[PDB]
Amino acid sequence: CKPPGSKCSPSMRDCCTTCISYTKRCRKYY
């Protein structure tokens, strides 16, 4: 998974947390 702050794909949610569909970045922890 992609670490927080990474760039991601919105419908893949391939981040370790969540993928911000607006910013295309990986969500914070909380």
Side-chain angles (χ1 to χ4, degrees), residues 13-26:
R13 181 178 300 204
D14 55 303
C15 300
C16 299
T17 49
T18 304
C19 177
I20 308 182
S21 306
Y22 184 61
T23 319
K24 299 69 62 183
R25 299 305 191 129
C26 299

Side-chain angles (χ1 to χ4, degrees), residues 2 4-13 15-17 20-22 24 27 29:
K2 291 177 170 61
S6 173
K7 182 180 180 175
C8 51
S9 38
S11 304
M12 290 292 179
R13 181 178 300 204
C15 300
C16 299
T17 49
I20 308 182
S21 306
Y22 184 61
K24 299 69 62 183
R27 186 184 167 163
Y29 289 96

